């Protein structure tokens, strides 16, 4: 199917409703590193087993949280290109699963959102770096640090000021302890945007005040559960206020170089001054390296999904064509 369009009616409304009750996980149900998608699956906005099509994902993030259409399209097709099965049109929101169907040849992994270094990456707020053994499960110690930062910088609530301080703390902790820490290109962008999402999308839409309480935060981050009577945001949004987060502690993209405390700036990386380069490298390097010489049906599926990806790219960038026109 085609990428869904924007919501026809984007008002705040009850999304924890009779048709979308929270249910616990059944054996085989998949949850991953994204509390948004996890919550949508656990309320039946997505299939409850955590395997979905790109169209299902885009519809769910819009309907359940009022995620904006362009952001939804870019994120979903990016994730699907690197982590999903392009023939079956299925993506796991967590671990690799036989439920996404017969795999393409190596080097494509079809690893789901749990695949480290494609979409998922280091210095997540409530998930540990892959180097430490688990990049997807809720981590209580890290959440308690989020609570502490909310107490210190947000009067007990999570807001953009808290995001700015916590984003930097997690980067500095990974620099100090993860000798494989990578913070370039696609991850450099998503790591900043994601810190705004709890303030923009987990705050009840009747308030929309950017101040997320810790009971709601835990419900989403740990239990994939909307608060009782949760209303979605009152208009479409994703990363608004990311400038506040960056401004708090501006960083350059880089990586540790096989040792702790060796953060080395990467001049080949995109940064916020070159957003089109982030798109071009994602396609020319990341996607192309997974599918260097695709067969007929895969080449077609790649080109279709790459066209959809480009719909999510901000105006002013030129589309690139790794497999011709
Ligand atoms: C539109 C499709 C979406 C996809 C494919 C997606 C995928 C992901 C992935 C792979 C991560 C892991 C990045 C990392 O920390 O390593 C992530 C993080 C995150 N996503 Fe999503 N996401 C989407 C939409 C949303 C929405 C709508 C929300 C909120 C309603 C949300 C909230 C978050 C948050 C808070 C994190 C950071 C978790 C943390 O650092 O502890 N995402 N997302
Ligand atoms: C849009 O949705 C809101 C909340 O569900 C509702 O009050 C309003 O009547 C809707 N608008 C239309 C034109 O149906
Ligand atoms: C280490 O970093 C490289 C990229 O620099 C990545 O491919 C690899 O998966 C990382 N592994 C872990 C466990 O962090
Ligand atoms: C959670 O994160 C902490 C702090 O980085 C880490 O020491 C711990 O091993 C992680 N995992 C669990 C299961 O607590
Ligand atoms: C975060 O909350 C604190 C305490 O209420 C406040 O000083 C700060 O201005 C807030 N920041 C935002 C962006 O709301
Ligand atoms: C991506 O590849 C296209 C040719 O298909 C080229 O014009 C463009 O400059 C490349 N961009 C990067 C960042 O490599
Ligand atoms: Cl929209
Ligand atoms: Mg991560």
From Swiss-Prot:
GO terms for biological process: hydrogen peroxide catabolic process. InterPro entries: Chloroperoxidase, Chloroperoxidase-like_sf. It is an enzyme of class 1 (oxidoreductase). GO terms for molecular function: heme binding; metal ion binding; peroxidase activity. It holds the Pfam family Peroxidase_2. Its cofactor is heme b. Disulfide bonds join 276-317. It comes from the Eukaryota. Heme binds at residue 34. Optimum pH is 4.7 with ABTS as substrate. Optimum pH is 7.2 with benzyl alcohol as substrate, and there is another optimum at pH 6.2. Optimum pH is 7.2 with dimethoxyphenol as substrate. Optimum pH is 6.0 with naphthalene as substrate. Optimum pH is 7.0 with pyridine as substrate. Optimum pH is 7.0 with veratryl alcohol as substrate, and there is another optimum at pH 5.5. N-glycosylated. Aromatic peroxidase that oxidizes aryl alcohols into the corresponding aldehydes and then into the corresponding benzoic acids. Oxidizes toluene and naphthalene. Catalyzes the regioselective peroxide-dependent hydroxylation of propranolol and diclofenac to 5-hydroxypropranolol and 4'-hydroxydiclofenac. Catalyzes the regioselective peroxide-dependent hydroxylation of naphthalene to 1-naphthol or 2-naphthol via a naphthalene 1,2-oxide intermediate. Catalyzes the regioselective peroxide-dependent oxidation of pyridine to pyridine N-oxide. Halogenates monochlorodimedone and phenol. Belongs to the chloroperoxidase family. This is Aromatic peroxygenase. It comes from Cyclocybe aegerita (Black poplar mushroom). The lineage of its organism: Eukaryota, Fungi, Dikarya, Basidiomycota, Agaricomycotina. The gene is APO1.
